[PDB]
Design a protein around this ligand. Structure first.
Ligand SMILES: Nc1nc2c(ncn2[C@@H]2O[C@H](COP(=O)(O)OP(=O)(O)OP(=O)(O)O)[C@@H](O)[C@H]2O)c(=O)[nH]1
Ligand SMILES: Nc1nc2c(ncn2[C@@H]2O[C@H](COP(=O)(O)OP(=O)(O)OP(=O)(O)O)[C@@H](O)[C@H]2O)c(=O)[nH]1
Ligand SMILES: Nc1nc2c(ncn2[C@@H]2O[C@H](COP(=O)(O)OP(=O)(O)O)[C@@H](O)[C@H]2O)c(=O)[nH]1
Ligand SMILES: Nc1nc2c(ncn2[C@@H]2O[C@H](COP(=O)(O)OP(=O)(O)O)[C@@H](O)[C@H]2O)c(=O)[nH]1
Ligand SMILES: [Mg+2]
Ligand SMILES: [Mg+2]
Lengths: 51, 433, 36, 428, 426, 426
């Protein structure tokens, strides 16, 4: 709680949260890429039902 | 040991609360049925029973049984107390006089009975937190009776409402200007603060800031979910500098009749776009005063800011925000009013925001919630007052309102009430030498 | 009969909409025709 | 928990509702005996709206069938979905009327409506919270218009603050089907303005003009027409049956879009209509649907809207669609066509969103619309009436057994008063 | 993304446009069932310029098939790619024009335009930000020229900014297809001068002259004749659908095409077009194109550029080629043939290079010839007009429909004015 | 902390920009993902991770050219917000880019420059790239810079203005857009550079030996010119020279902001075996009038001022024999009021080898930036071509019918007339 403001709060807390923010976002880029696959197969389901 | 009671009324109000209450459960780690997966942060929006069950502090009321059923039989079945989650008898059907006189009257006694049974379990109560609309009958007329009864039953409790304003250009209801004028007699002296969230913000912020096209209301309500979680988190999560609810009221509001702030959630960015830039305190504060990011369709350059309240979340250092405020004060374009030279707050919370599954927001190191009081919301009524008097001039759609018991003269009484409120923003925008 | 009158001017649903279902890895399997 | 009561009259109203009871049965998954062969939990939660329960499983309709001629009374029962109705609900006269408005209103009308009023109060006593009443009939015949009039004449006596939606087949613009349709219409319209809360007009060859140019089917019977008008019937009463982010039941669908308590004559219409030849060629999205929603060729009344001005319109939507772009494009309808809309109501369009579409269609919509263009029908049918009343033609079957010509005179005056009020509110 | 819609009118127009829609589908990789079959992404790229997306990957040829005769409609619809066209865009009538320009203009012409402009509006509202309009027709054909004449005087007031083009088939300077041509050509070109932003004159005979020697084909039936004009159409619009280093769309063209807003009748032309016995030798590269662009034998309209002057000639290239090999092989031209070239415009050349070629050929170009000499083709049909008109040969068909001889003189005067302006600017 | 915004508007801007941002990645060690496989403060603005989005605002009014830039290999590199797209082209017409499709997009791009300018705290100047060909690169930029001058202004408006060639051109209204943008360049441009690319059309087959050169070849060599002048900022040096230090030593009077630049060691691989690269020799060879990229003959144009970049293994003694050799050689032109007139630009870091690009691994990259009176000759021929059209008012109607007015052409003459006289009386 005092070496935070020369050190550990930076480069051990900010650069590790940022390390999370990088890898954590990759799930959202993977999860949303699955929900876009929902719509594109739903349209196949609405194409064969329209057919 | 301090807590905030919420009430959500109207179809608009109940579904923006479903986005509010999905976020409350995913913030504190609470399952959709009530029990903790296995603190005191629950005791602001959640009551802890003998088991792990966390009954929500809200009461959802609406006169349409249709919209209340899908939350009665949805995935939040076991969460809500089934007698809290109260239904109606018949639709208010887009009529102020219906929701105020004839069909909303048989629900006041049961709603106020549940607010009493909820406020006595309360021990350190700060104030109410209202959720309604301006368009429909039960979003406007039924909440009017609520402000009528809560002002006399409680009094000194500070109530806040997150209203959804009628949009200036698009609109979905024909007689909703009538409903957005008569409600103003009961949101002026019966409401302590009134947040306005128009359907023109996420109309285009979800298009330009977020790369997703064609948004719908389940994406509209998440941004309204994020802001309320940002405001109450100072009551709820620890910080280097916290802003209580009563802290927030007396500071942002100048005058007893001027309590109509704007809103802005700055770090609204998509997942595929967020890693393309760093989100600093100075950048996310400069991106929040921009006229393409406010929550109401009104240009802030026409008006002058009275006082702005800023709530930061997560990883924010309290020197960069002071550098951000000084950098954004020295620009000439954002002009403040002369009689309030400071015009600013800061508020720090340690916990970063959560993102719901399926959401288009990307989670951030830091999130700022800018809550600005402007006199540019004077012309928020200008495109509604001209919207009003054109319909009123030839007695269009008046026979329904006077047919339900409402007197004709109460239309013009609300007309002059808003005309006086517009005069107040012309009075405060004049400099004194 | 999947529908009521085969060959309506408006529309005739000639597929059992029970088999019409999609899901996510982390979601429940719900049907398409029926929806909220 | 609220419900609407269906009730049909005449040969037209019997056939229209028989197809309507057949197009909502598959929507709620009902076989032609009454059992629920469905697949969804939100198909049975609002079954109390347009159906009611029996001794387990069996869902019986709540429609009364008044029909002064029995020769089309057995036609609905002998159909595929005719066993679903309870038989003692059926009420019929021994002898037909003969297409006299007065004979179905005064002399044998009163012999039956005591029983018809008896069976509507029997069913409405059992209902928990009644929301409205529903009629389907035609103006051009005594058993439909006259019997429908006498029902409405005293149903407002006992249900004053309950809404009424009636789906009335307005008589033919181009080629007429009975020679006394000017007389039957002008007394029905005189009696359809003061008591009905909300009405629809159904031009007959607007259905024929749809089935020729839009649908392009070579041999259309009345079953194809009856299915098309009933698709609009189901679209009106959908929001109080299925959830949504913005719904509009019948009470909301009227009291915010009738400006004045006597102007309630509307333009119906069903949005997604495609031919066989052009069905793989049409995309399914909101902007293409509205270009089919608002055009004159896809309408349920033969009178164009280009000769008048829209006062209020309503468009109920069914299915998931992002309706933020619905508000975007409907504004583009407002901006591109401003002379066809009244300027004294800047907010002319209305939305409603239903969460589920009709079964199998990806998304669908129904058009409700009030216009001053209704005048070009009423101003002519007044001219048709005046061209036949002044010559004392076809009158001794009305004056000789029923009312005098003073009721005929005040019927013309009430029409001509309705003629002046649409004109004076066309420019405001 | 900017898009155009076809407006093929008449028997001459509908056959050209369908053969044009044939070639467009081949280059964008589309089948008669509309399904995408292109082996890359550039065949899609901006597919909205010609094709509107439908369900199942289907692409409809955004085009209304205006005519007055069912027989032409039957032939195009029953073609190999006739299925892909939308049946709602098959607006047609039954009473023929009889090659009378008036009959295709006022009796049934003026009774079907309201329906055609309704489905013209259909394409325009559906597309987001359109670039212009395209309309194939003849000059001497009554429903082709006449109905097309009334469209270009109706879509132009509807959509002025959108630059609208006609691939008008200017009548023969020799063997006449009908007897009616000088009447119909003069009347339409009186409106072609003040309706379209760029008219592409098409002579059948100079188009034959391609198949005479340049293709040296033995018996050319109208198939490759239509294919020949379709090649020029495809390469003109190449900068709107296909990536290119010097992307000069029709918008970039027309502002360099028209020097004064009366002169827009510039003869098109394709360029690597050769024969079966010359492909064995010909080397696909820049200089051997310029050989066969700036030749006086590749012009689609006859009106040879020896009897005129190059106002602002242009050629829209296709294929991967040097941009310093073009510059030289397009300036060496002016420096040489200096007479045709008008010294008034110091460098009257549009190097418009597209990256990807037509599929089936490497080094391509579409030379739109902006020579003056088109007025001689106009003075040719003016003399054929007045020789027939002054004696009052056959005009009671016109004057009975209200088309009196007064507007015949106006058509001759305005086109003789158009002869003068091309002649004065050389 | 010595940073710059590399604005790229029009086609020829961003095509140079891609060839720019190619070698900009190599020298700063940045993959097309923006990450490392601070010299990159000047460009490549810092982000949260090891990614670096380039300091640039890629503006286009036509969808296509910016699109393959977007979907190229630099898709991660090039940030979508700085990748401004348009829909309607400017039709190679100054009037359209400046008025019609001007204020339509000028609002977004001023915001987009500003957004990166917030990160750009202590910046040097704005690297704006545009042609003199058409409203995307002619009219929009004239609107852009005057907005940039009124907001920021003091920041260097150092402009890579691509000049029209003395003989070749893509356009025919090429003299129009040029003579308009050049005179608007006078009121709002700090140190506007000149890119004629006609001697580039010559030294490609001499110093590069690329027969059949293509647009890419040019832009790569132009991007090396931008690299050498800015490498002083990003990298280090014994006499490295700031962008402010370039301008207020080079431009003598405010209307003389038009120097000519050329790469000195343009030698490619086949000659590089036989070339003795000695710093004194190459900058001596640089001055030879066949090599300067601007065609207008410097040999007669007096050396009013001259800057010399010195990149690579350059030695301070060896650049003084370089000055002396040019001095004693009196046949090389000199001004009569600056005795020396030199600016020495020592830079330790050697030039990069672009992948496949023919510029060999030359150890040194000496460059040269001399303000000559020769630019008056390039102005005069440009002025002459405009006069021939504007004498009898050809093609003015497209321009004046798109938001512009005929007096602007006439006032473009008078402002040009002052411009040659700035480079004549001195
Ligand atoms: N934010 C939001 N708005 C909605 C939602 N559903 C509908 N709306 C729109 O918001 C506007 C205001 O809604 P309300 O005033 O609450 O309408 P209402 O309560 O259903 O009207 P009544 O029940 O008849 O009194 C309406 O015009 C709707 O079009 C929703 O779920 N969220
Ligand atoms: N691409 C490119 N163009 C060059 C180069 N050198 C000179 N130019 C000329 O610069 C002009 C660039 O065009 P722009 O400035 O973008 O204006 P434009 O003609 O409207 O081009 P578009 O935006 O594509 O419509 C071309 O006409 C070329 O003749 C070069 O090296 N590369
Ligand atoms: N669409 C439709 N119209 C009908 C049908 N049966 C009758 N009509 C119309 O009803 C009008 C007169 O019917 P009518 O004999 O009076 O039936 P009634 O009212 O039951 O006596 C005619 O114009 C018919 O077009 C039907 O099955 N479908
Ligand atoms: N490729 C092609 N050209 C044609 C065809 N039919 C006619 N033409 C040209 O059009 C001219 C006749 O035009 P016209 O009869 O007035 O056209 P219409 O109005 O559609 O009948 C002929 O001289 C031909 O040169 C065709 O089927 N294909
Ligand atoms: Mg409601
Ligand atoms: Mg371009």
């Amino acid at each position: 709680q005092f070496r935070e403001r020369c050190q550990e709060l930076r480069a051990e807390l900010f650069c590790i949260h940022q390390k999370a923010v990088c890898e954590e976002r990759k799930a959202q880029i993977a999860f949303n890429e699955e929900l876009k696959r929902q719509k594109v197969v739903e349209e196949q389901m609405f194409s064969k039902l329209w057919e | 040991m301090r807590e905030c009671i919420s009430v959500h009324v109207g179809q608009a109000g109940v579904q923006i609360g479903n986005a509010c209450w999905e976020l409350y459960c995913l913030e504190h780690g609470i399952q959709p049925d009530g029990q903790m997966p296995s603190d005191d942060s629950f005791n602001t929006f959640f009551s802890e029973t003998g088991a792990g069950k966390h009954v929500p502090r809200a009461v959802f009321v609406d006169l349409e049984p249709t919209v209340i059923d899908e939350v009665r039989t949805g995935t939040y079945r076991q969460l809500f107390h089934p007698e809290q989650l109260i239904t109606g008898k018949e639709d208010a059907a887009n009529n102020y006089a219906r929701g105020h006189y004839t069909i909303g009257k048989e629900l006041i006694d049961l709603v106020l009975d549940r607010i009493r049974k909820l406020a006595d379990q309360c021990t350190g109560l700060q104030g109410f937190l209202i959720f309604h609309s301006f368009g429909g009958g039960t979003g406007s007329g039924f909440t009017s009776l609520l402000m009528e009864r809560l002002s006399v039953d409680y009094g000194k409790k500070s109530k806040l409402e997150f209203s959804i304003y009628p949009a200036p250009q698009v609109s979905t209801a024909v007689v909703e200007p009538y409903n957005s004028i008569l409600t103003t007699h009961t949101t002026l002296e019966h409401s302590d603060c009134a947040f306005m969230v128009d359907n023109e913000a996420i109309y285009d912020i979800c298009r330009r800031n977020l790369d997703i096209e064609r948004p719908t209301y389940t994406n509209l309500n998440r941004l309204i979910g994020q802001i309320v979680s940002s405001i109450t988190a100072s009551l709820r999560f620890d910080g280097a500098l916290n802003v209580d609810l009563t802290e927030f009221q007396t500071n942002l509001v100048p005058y007893p009749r001027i309590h109509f702030p704007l809103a802005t959630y700055a770090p609204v960015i998509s997942a595929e776009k967020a890693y393309h830039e760093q989100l600093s305190v100075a950048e996310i504060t400069n991106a929040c005063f921009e006229p393409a990011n406010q929550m109401v369709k009104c240009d802030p350059r026409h008006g002058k800011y009275m006082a702005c309240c800023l709530l930061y979340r997560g990883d924010v250092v309290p020197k960069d925000v002071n550098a951000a405020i000084a950098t954004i004060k020295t620009k000439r374009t954002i002009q403040f009013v002369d009689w309030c030279p400071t015009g600013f707050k800061v508020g720090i919370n340690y916990q970063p925001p959560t993102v719901v599954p399926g959401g288009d927001l990307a989670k951030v190191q830091r999130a700022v919630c800018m809550l600005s009081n402007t006199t540019a919301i004077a012309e928020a009524w200008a495109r509604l007052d001209h919207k009003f008097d054109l319909m009123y001039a030839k007695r269009a759609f008046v026979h329904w309102y006077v047919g339900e018991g409402m007197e004709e003269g109460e239309f013009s009484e609300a007309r002059e009430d808003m005309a006086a409120l517009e005069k107040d923003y012309e009075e405060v925008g004049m400099d004194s030498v | 009969p999947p529908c009521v009158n085969p060959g309506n001017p408006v529309f005739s649903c000639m597929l059992d909409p029970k088999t019409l279902h999609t899901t996510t890895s982390l979601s429940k399997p719900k049907m398409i025709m029926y929806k909220t | 928990m609220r419900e609407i009561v269906h009730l049909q009259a005449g040969q037209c109203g019997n056939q229209i509702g028989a197809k309507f009871w057949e197009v909502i049965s598959d929507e709620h998954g009902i076989d032609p005996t009454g059992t629920y062969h469905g697949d969804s939990d939100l198909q049975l939660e609002r079954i109390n709206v347009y159906y009611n329960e029996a001794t387990g499983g069996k869902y019986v309709p709540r429609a009364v069938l008044v029909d002064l001629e029995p020769g089309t009374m057995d036609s609905v029962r002998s159909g595929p979905f005719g066993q679903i109705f309870r038989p003692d609900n059926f009420v019929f006269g021994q002898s037909g009327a003969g297409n006299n408005w007065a004979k179905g209103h005064y002399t044998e009308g009163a012999e039956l409506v005591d029983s018809v009023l008896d069976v509507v109060r029997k069913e409405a006593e059992s209902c928990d919270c009644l929301q409205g009443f529903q009629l389907t009939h035609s103006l051009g015949g005594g058993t439909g218009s006259g019997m429908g009039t006498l029902l409405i004449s005293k149903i407002r006596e006992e249900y004053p603050d309950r809404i009424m939606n009636t789906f009335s087949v307005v008589p033919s613009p181009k080629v007429s089907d009975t020679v006394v349709e000017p007389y039957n219409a002008t007394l029905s319209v005189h009696q359809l303005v003061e008591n009905t809360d909300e009405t629809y007009c159904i031009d007959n060859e607007a259905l024929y003009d749809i089935c020729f140019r839009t649908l392009k089917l070579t041999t259309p019977t009345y079953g194809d027409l009856n299915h098309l008008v009933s698709a609009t019937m189901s679209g009106v009463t959908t929001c109080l049956r299925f959830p949504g982010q913005l719904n509009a039941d019948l009470r909301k669908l009227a009291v915010n879009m009738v400006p004045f308590p006597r102007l309630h004559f509307f333009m119906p219409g069903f949005a997604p209509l495609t031919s066989r030849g052009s069905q793989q060629y049409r995309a399914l999205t909101v902007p293409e649907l509205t270009q089919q929603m608002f055009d004159a060729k896809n309408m349920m009344a033969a009178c164009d809207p280009r000769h008048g001005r829209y006062l209020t319109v309503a468009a109920v939507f069914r299915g998931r669609m992002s309706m933020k772009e619905v508000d975007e494009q409907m504004l583009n309808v407002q901006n591109k066509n401003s002379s066809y809309f009244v300027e004294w109501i800047p907010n002319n369009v209305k939305t409603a969103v239903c969460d589920i579409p009709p079964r199998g269609l990806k998304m669908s919509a129904t058009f409700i619309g009030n216009s001053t263009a209704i005048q070009e029908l009423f101003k002519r049918i007044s001219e048709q009436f005046t061209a036949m009343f002044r010559r004392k033609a076809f009158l001794h079957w009305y004056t000789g057994e029923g009312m005098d010509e003073m009721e005929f005179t005040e019927a013309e005056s009430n029409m001509n008063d309705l003629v002046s009020e649409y004109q004076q509110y066309q420019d405001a």
